[PDB]
């Protein structure tokens, strides 16, 4: 309330009200409503006494402001309210003696020279008549009365004491105060000159009081006891008294951390007894075979594009006798081959519809019908064989070899570029010119790396999957894994990488799973490394010539499942690009901080004064190898892409917990002498995440190798 | 639609729930009622929008006649559907119709965008005409500061902003204009005229006005300029390791000077607070009282903070000592009186702070951290900002710390005063002594080895970045960011203008203000005779003419009566001080005769009336025969350019009737014309429902209510039945005058204190 008083009242009136409250020993802070009432009383008294003067004849009249008439300018009303009690009493007595009038037994508010009377001014929230009668009874007829209410009504002992303007102005001020209070919700809280002596009432019932009584710390028996104890008892070293007795077997166990303490994380990956990690990513990355058709540039529906792409390659389109290279463990060769044949027929059909024409064979090919039937709780309670499935923990695998090869291959330039970005407005400021130069130098590098093509393929596939799911809910659909690739000459090839059957996506929630089966063209015979493909049932659907060198063409078939969350994140996987640029930007900026000019050409290609910037990128035979700035940018972009594709709970738990060791190593390299409390705890936390994620296992392997390198290089 | 409104109301009331809720919840409670929505907010807006854009008709069109302009299917493309809706009760549509509307359809009005979206186009103008420069790739030092993100036409607090918006674009529901529309009358009328002639939905205009008025401030890392114009482009200008040169396409100094003058005027008298607030709320800067820029900026000079405390405003609770802004970090200092010998040999009894303490310290552009113990400074960390600011910070922190070395370093004498001629406490006397003679405690303070470290480097007594620094002082090559939690905690004001905390501790003292004079870059026009008997003759003439101009209605009305009471005004007494004594009486007689002739044998002429009125304060001295002396060139004190021309105009006064403009002391003011017509044009701002006061209840004797336009038809003193705010029928009376509550309160206080003194 005090804020409202400060805002709506002048400091002078507030000071007068505070002085009056002090004279009565009443605290303004503890009774803000009373302070507001006193301030309003003073303000209305001053407002009444203003502007009113008496002419030489003694007739009431108005006098202008800022325009004095010698000295006297006798005002009509002399304010008595607001003076110190002694001074107010003396002034009242002096006026009574001077004008020969009886001295009121009660101190007055104003005095009118014209009527030669003492006037009392009152305010109320109730009816003016009631307050007027109460005040008259308390004080009597010795003093004229003027009471105003907040509802635009008033009671005046004499109707000629105040003109229309004065009453209108006081009522306007009161109404404005009321409206402002209501806007601030203080109106209901506000309590008048008869209830302001009570205060807020909020008393606890019986059940809540009992709950408070039993919810007191140990050693107490009632909340009154706790309240008295807290208000009275003074601790003057209780902390030290408790510490002086607490057992010395509790402590942070502070141990200094040296290089030797750090050991490789997740030694079980090295062990060969465990199985090689399989390829669990949604789509093939370094094995995709692009059925490429040159196109003028027209963008067409994916179904028509796939139709045309197969039309160009009649041998693969019309292949109908498969050669099973391997049926993995559970999937049925007949189901997968018939489903793929239906896919090809639907794609190549004359009708634009891209929905499976069988609708019944796919139901068992995708395993939708192989689901349990839910019963009510009662039967489950009664039946004895309805147990609870044991949790299925992930397998503990070893370091594979395909992950490293894919990491290498996706991070190399290719003549084909797909990543294209929309234009932006002309750059007129120097800063945006520098930004444009840096952006061009970056895209000239990233665009031609195969990881960019894989990322665009993933984004396009997930966008198409989301569109199909939203449009089609309870019907099986056919979805080409399409991409668009522009070569250096500007030819806009359209690439078909395979097909996918989408199941029934009629799902209200987001976490609900929808099954999709992917058939992918590839040029890799899995028999070369069968450990990479234990989840895939494949055929050998023919061969093709790229330039005269015949190479086989297989179809990798696999059933999988996704959800709306991963489905959306597929189209948000483009942010990897941003993560690739930000850091490099920072790098370049750091260089610019050293020497004044801009180095984006120097770091990338070098200049006559500075050599090209080279990072440490790889290794061979125990010999670390450098790498150009562009290659390092490619490595970072591929790292981000893998952080996405192989991302799950294990990856998060691994990264967010190995960051501890990363920062500890960073501190050690700066000779900060970091100390640790429980190292084995951190190591266990980290290594309880290396179970079956290929990227997690390879990250652990690379971390161990890099830690070994840092250990060997720490000698200097 | 009003019939549709009443039919909908009747249908809604037919249900008992509507009847009971409507008759139960007052108008104020409506807010609560509105907030009881489903709150079934979409969990993922991206997925929802993606799905909706692929649906046949995601757009929710409002029912109306617009749809008939477009077929339900154009060129074989489905656009809109006639199926009913439950969520919005309208129709459905697709982005195809939106694109067609952008292609064809009704053509609207382009005028509204010229002024309605003024802020955006001003942003574009500031961008287009900006001039760019070089790029500095070197590291940039940035400080975290509270900066205004966007420029504001006139910064005001949120409540005043809302009230102004309502008074602008909501002519109805304008009960009892507060003491805020008169301050912003020019803004009210300007925005009202600009937005008239539009058809945009009112809520859009209200939100845009809120953006254009209500301030938006944030903590940002900045280096260099800090005005909102540069902050708009901070994303491009600044940079962690790069900087750009940018130049985007005043009142502050004047307010500083005015606040300092008010402080000096009020301090010398007894009960300074009331006099200071009277002058502050009676002052004006060219269009508005001082509560139009004081309330705009956050904090400011100590004088402005003290005045704001005297007025009603929020001030940052930083402790001002001289120029230092101090923010306590920890520790409690016990202020105990002690007798200490000063280096001059004298012994002074002053308050010393027992116990350790630490304060963030700021002075101009210098920031730092100070840690002090009783009778000793312990540590001081600073950043290199400016030699003058660094020296001021060092010296002021030295004096504040009350280090025994500082006392032992005194060599002269401490008997100084202020411009008002008062003896200050020994602390401020020492402050002035040391600032006047900076090389007094610096020599005998003692030196300390340089802060050997990676970045910490010392500074010598000459403020150069030289090693062998002062004992304790340290300069770190980093950024010190301080002054968090600007709570603006409750602060009291004593009569002597000195602020205090919620407790009895004193934060700002009356003598913190620095006694430095400047020149008001604007017309500082007061309204009280007491104030302006300090400055030059030109200032006196300008202020007297402004006083005459402001209350032109009253003087013009008194002119018709033809009585000498009009001339015996206190406002002209100060003018008497700048008229030669040997000749002022002749001027008074001549002007009185000329004005009597004007009243008798010709018609209104405001310019000459204003020019000739003020000189008549002194008594006349007629010719020996009795006729008045005749003049055409009224000389003023100072000679030369200080002279008034009776005929047409002079350097101090020239009115041109071709454009009807007034130039006083080299300042053009718009006298639209003459006549109560120009008076009412001046009143063209004000506020709807400003000429009517409230008196009585509904009083159905008048029948139905009447609009503002029909309200104006009523003659003064009538009774009318109107609706206040959202309903609330009341009875009002047309006003016969213009009111000023601050003036009434000030005069009441003056009478009260006159009575107190007379009895005393």
From TrEMBL, chain A:
This is Polymerase acidic protein. Belongs to the influenza viruses PA family. The lineage of its organism: Viruses, Riboviria, Orthornavirae, Negarnaviricota, Polyploviricotina. The keyword Manganese applies. Binds 2 manganese ions per subunit. Influenza RNA polymerase is composed of three subunits: PB1, PB2 and PA. Interacts (via C-terminus) with PB1 (via N-terminus). It comes from Influenza B virus. GO terms for cellular component: host cell cytoplasm; host cell nucleus. Phosphorylated on serines and threonines by host kinases, including human casein kinase II. HAMAP family: INFV_PA (MF_04063). Mg(2+) 2 binds at residues 81, 109. Mn(2+) 2 binds at residues 81, 109.
Automatic annotation (TrEMBL), chain B:
One of its GO terms (cellular component) is host cell mitochondrion. Disulfide bonds join 259-304. It is found in: Host mitochondrion; Virion; Host nucleus. Residues 39-107 form the Influenza RNA polymerase PB2 second domain. GO terms for molecular function: RNA binding; RNA-directed RNA polymerase activity. Residues 3-38 form the Influenza RNA polymerase PB2 N-terminal region domain. Coiled coil: none annotated. A motif (Nuclear localization signal) lies at residues 734-737. Residues 250-315 form the Polymerase basic protein 2 helical domain. Residues 526-679 form the Influenza RNA polymerase PB2 sixth domain. The keyword Ribonucleoprotein does not apply. It holds the Pfam family Flu_PB2_4th. Residues 108-249 form the Influenza RNA polymerase PB2 middle domain. GO terms for biological process: 7-methylguanosine mRNA capping; cap snatching; DNA-templated transcription; symbiont-mediated suppression of host gene expression; symbiont-mediated suppression of host mRNA transcription via inhibition of RNA polymerase II activity; viral RNA genome replication. Keywords: Cap snatching, Eukaryotic host gene expression shutoff by virus, Eukaryotic host transcription shutoff by virus, Host gene expression shutoff by virus, Host nucleus, Host-virus interaction, Inhibition of host RNA polymerase II by virus, mRNA capping, mRNA processing, Viral transcription, Virion. Residues 316-525 form the Influenza RNA polymerase PB2 CAP binding domain. InterPro entries: Flu_PB2_2nd, Flu_PB2_6th, Flu_PB2_C, Flu_PB2_CAP-bd, Flu_PB2_middle, Flu_PB2_N, INV_PB2, PB2_helical. It comes from the Viruses. Plays an essential role in transcription initiation and cap-stealing mechanism, in which cellular capped pre-mRNAs are used to generate primers for viral transcription. Recognizes and binds a wide range of cap structures of target pre-RNAs which are subsequently cleaved after 10-13 nucleotides by the viral protein PA. Plays a role in the initiation of the viral genome replication and modulates the activity of the ribonucleoprotein (RNP) complex. Belongs to the influenza viruses PB2 family. Influenza RNA polymerase is composed of three subunits: PB1, PB2 and PA. Interacts (via N-terminus) with PB1 (via C-terminus). Interacts with nucleoprotein NP (via N-terminus). This is Polymerase basic protein 2. It comes from Influenza B virus. The gene is PB2.
């Amino acid at each position: 309330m005090d804020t409202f008083i400060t805002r709506n009242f002048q400091t002078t009136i507030i000071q007068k009200a505070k002085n009056t409250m002090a004279e009565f020993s009443e605290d303004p802070e503890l009774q803000p409503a009373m302070l507001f009432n006193i301030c309003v009383h003073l303000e209305v008294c001053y407002v009444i006494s203003d502007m009113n003067f008496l002419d030489e004849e003694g007739k009431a009249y108005t006098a202008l402001e800022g325009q004095g008439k010698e000295q006297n300018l006798r005002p009509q009303y002399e304010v008595i309210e607001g003076m110190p009690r002694t001074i107010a009493w003396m002034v009242q007595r002096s006026l009574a003696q001077e004008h020969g009038i009886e001295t009121p037994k009660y101190l007055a508010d104003l005095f009118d020279y014209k009527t030669k009377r003492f006037i009392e001014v009152g305010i109320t929230k109730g009816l003016a008549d009631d307050y007027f009668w109460k005040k008259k009874e308390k004080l009597g007829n010795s003093m004229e009365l003027m009471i105003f209410s907040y509802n635009q009504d008033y009671s005046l002992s004499n109707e000629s004491s105040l003109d229309e303007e004065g009453k209108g102005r006081v009522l306007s001020r009161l109404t404005e105060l009321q409206a402002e209070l209501s806007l601030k919700n203080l109106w209901q809280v506000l309590i008048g000159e008869e209830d302001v002596e009570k205060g807020i009432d909020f008393k606890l019932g019986q059940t809540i009081s009992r709950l408070r009584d039993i919810s007191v710390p140990a050693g107490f028996s009632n909340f009154e006891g706790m309240r008295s104890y807290i208000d009275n008892i003074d601790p003057k070293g209780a902390i030290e008294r408790n510490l002086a007795r607490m057992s010395p077997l509790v402590s942070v166990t502070p141990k200094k951390l040296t290089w030797e303490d750090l050991r490789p994380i997740g030694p079980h990956i090295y062990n060969h007894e465990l199985p090689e990690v399989p390829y669990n990513a949604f789509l093939l990355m370094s094995d995709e075979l692009g059925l490429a058709n040159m196109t003028e540039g027209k963008s067409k529906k994916p179904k028509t594009l796939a139709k045309e792409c197969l039309e160009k390659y009649s041998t693969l389109r019309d292949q109908t006798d498969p050669i099973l290279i391997m049926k993995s463990e559970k999937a049925n060769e007949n189901f997968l081959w018939k489903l793929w044949r239906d896919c090809v027929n639907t794609i190549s059909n004359e009708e634009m519809s891209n929905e499976l024409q069988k609708t019944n064979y796919a139901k068992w090919a995708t395993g939708d019908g192989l689901t349990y039937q839910k019963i009510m709780k009662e039967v489950a309670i009664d039946d004895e064989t309805m147990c609870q499935e044991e949790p299925k923990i992930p397998n503990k695998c070893r370091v594979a070899a395909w992950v490293q090869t894919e990491m290498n291959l996706l991070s190399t330039l290719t003549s084909k570029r797909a990543l294209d970005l929309p234009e932006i407005g002309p750059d007129v400021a120097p800063v945006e010119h520098v930004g444009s130069e840096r952006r061009k130098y970056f895209v000239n590098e990233i665009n031609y790396c195969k990881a960019s093509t894989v990322m665009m393929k993933y984004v396009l596939f997930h966008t198409s999957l989301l569109n199909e799911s939203n449009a089609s809910m309870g019907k099986y659909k056919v979805i080409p894994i399409t991409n668009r690739v522009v070569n250096e000459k500007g030819e806009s090839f359209d690439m078909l990488y395979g097909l996918a059957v989408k199941g029934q996506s009629h799902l209200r929630g987001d976490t609900d799973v929808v099954t999709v089966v992917t058939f992918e063209f590839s040029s890799t015979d899995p028999r070369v490394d069968s450990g990479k493909w234990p989840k895939y049932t494949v055929f050998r659907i023919g061969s093709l010539f790229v330039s005269g060198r015949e190479k086989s063409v297989y179809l990798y078939c696999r059933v999988n499942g996704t959800n709306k969350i991963q489905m959306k994140w597929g189209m948000e996987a483009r942010r990897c690009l941003l993560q690739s640029m930000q850091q490099m930007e920072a790098i370049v900026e750091q260089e610019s901080s050293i020497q004044g000019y801009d180095m984006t050409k120097a770091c990338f290609k070098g200049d006559r004064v500075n050599s090209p910037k080279t990072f440490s990128i790889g290794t061979q035979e125990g010999k670390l190898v450098k790498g150009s700035f562009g290659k390092a940018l490619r490595v970072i972009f591929t790292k981000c892409l893998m952080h996405y594709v192989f991302g799950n709970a294990q990856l998060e738990g691994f990264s967010a917990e190995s960051r501890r060791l990363l920062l500890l190593i960073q501190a050690l390299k700066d000779r900060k002498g970091p100390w640790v409390f429980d190292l084995e705890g951190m190591y266990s936390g980290i290594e309880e995440c290396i179970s079956n994620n290929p990227w997690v296992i390879q990250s652990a392997y690379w971390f161990n190798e890099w830690l070994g390198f840092e250990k060997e290089g720490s000698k200097v | 639609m009003t019939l549709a409104k009443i039919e909908l109301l009747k249908q809604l009331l037919r249900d008992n729930e509507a009847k009971t809720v409507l008759k139960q919840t007052t108008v104020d409670q409506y807010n609560i009622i509105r907030k009881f929505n489903t709150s079934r907010i979409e969990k993922n807006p991206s997925l929802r929008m993606k799905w909706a854009m692929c649906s046949n008709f995601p757009l929710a069109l409002t029912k109306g006649d617009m749809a008939n302009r477009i077929p339900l299917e154009y060129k074989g493309i489905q656009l809109k559907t006639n199926a009913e809706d439950i969520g919005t009760k309208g129709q459905m549509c697709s982005i195809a119709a939106v694109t067609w509307w952008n292609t064809y359809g009704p053509i609207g009005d382009t005028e509204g965008f010229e002024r309605v979206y003024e802020s955006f186009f001003l942003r574009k103008m500031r961008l287009d005409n900006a001039t760019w420069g070089r790029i500095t790739f070197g590291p940039v030092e940035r400080v975290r500061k509270r900066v205004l993100l966007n420029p504001l036409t006139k910064e005001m607090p949120p409540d005043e902003a809302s009230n102004v918006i309502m008074e602008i674009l909501f002519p109805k529901e304008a009960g009892i204009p507060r003491e805020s529309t008169w301050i912003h009358r020019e803004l009210i009328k300007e925005k009202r005229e600009k937005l008239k002639g539009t058809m945009i939905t009112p809520i859009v205009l209200a939100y845009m006005l809120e953006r254009e008025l209500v301030a938006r401030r944030r903590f940002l890392p900045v280096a260099g300029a800090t005005s909102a114009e540069f902050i708009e482009m901070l994303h491009c200008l600044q940079g962690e390791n790069w900087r750009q040169i940018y130049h985007p396409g005043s009142r502050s100094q004047s307010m500083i000077v005015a606040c300092r003058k008010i402080i000096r005027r009020s301090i010398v008298a007894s009960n300074p607070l009331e006099l200071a607030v009277e002058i502050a709320n009676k002052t004006v800067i060219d269009t508005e009282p001082l509560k139009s820029c004081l309330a705009a900026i956050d904090g400011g000079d100590v004088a402005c903070d003290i005045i704001r405390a005297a007025l009603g405003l929020k001030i940052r609770q930083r402790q001002r000592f001289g120029r230092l802004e101090l923010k306590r970090i920890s520790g409690r200092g016990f202020k105990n009186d002690e007798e200490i010998l000063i280096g001059n040999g004298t012994i002074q009894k002053i308050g010393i702070w027992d116990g350790e303490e630490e304060f963030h310290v700021r002075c101009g552009e210098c920031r730092g951290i100070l840690k002090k113990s009783k009778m000793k400074l312990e540590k001081l960390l600073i950043n290199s900002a400016k030699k003058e600011d660094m020296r001021d910070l060092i010296i002021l922190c030295m004096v504040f710390s009350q280090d025994t070395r500082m006392f032992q370093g005194v060599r002269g004498e401490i008997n100084f005063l202020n411009r008002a001629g008062q003896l200050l406490s020994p602390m401020y006397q020492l402050q002035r002594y040391f600032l006047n003679r900076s090389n007094d405690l610096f020599d005998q303070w003692g030196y300390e080895e340089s802060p050997k470290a990676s970045e910490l480097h010392g500074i010598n007594e000459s403020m150069n970045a030289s090693d062998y620094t002062l004992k304790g002082v340290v300069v770190t090559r980093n950024v010190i960011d301080d002054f968090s939690s600007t709570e603006t905690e409750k602060v009291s004001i004593t009569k002597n203008l000195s602020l205090i905390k919620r407790t009895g501790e004193v934060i700002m003292g009356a003598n913190d203000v620095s006694e430095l004079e400047s020149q008001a870059q604007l017309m500082i026009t007061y309204d009280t005779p007491k104030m302006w008997e300090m400055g030059t003759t030109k200032e006196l003439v300008q202020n007297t003419y402004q006083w005459v101009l402001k209350n032109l209605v009253t003087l013009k009305a008194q002119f018709l009566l033809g009585k000498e009471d009009m001339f015996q005004w206190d406002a002209f007494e100060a003018f008497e001080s700048i008229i030669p004594q040997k000749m002022a009486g002749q001027y008074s007689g001549f002007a009185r005769a000329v004005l009597k002739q004007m009243r008798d044998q010709e018609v209104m002429k405001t310019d000459q009336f204003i020019k000739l009125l003020p000189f008549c304060f002194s008594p006349p001295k007629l010719r020996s025969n009795g006729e008045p002396y005749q003049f055409l060139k009224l000389v003023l004190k100072g000679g030369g350019e200080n002279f008034i021309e009776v005929r047409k105009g002079s350097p101090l006064f020239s009115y041109n009737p071709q454009t009807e403009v007034l130039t006083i002391c080299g300042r053009m003011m718009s006298l639209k014309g003459k006549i109560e017509d120009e008076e009412r044009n001046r009143s063209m701002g004000n506020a709807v429902l400003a000429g009517f006061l409230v008196s009585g209840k509904y009083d159905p004797d008048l029948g139905d209510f009447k609009t503002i336009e029909e309200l104006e038809k009523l003659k003064p003193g009538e009774k009318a039945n109107i609706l206040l705010y959202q309903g609330k029928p009341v009875k009002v009376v047309k006003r016969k005058r213009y009111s000023a509550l601050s003036n009434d309160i000030s005069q009441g206080i003056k009478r009260q204190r006159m009575t107190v003194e007379s009895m005393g």
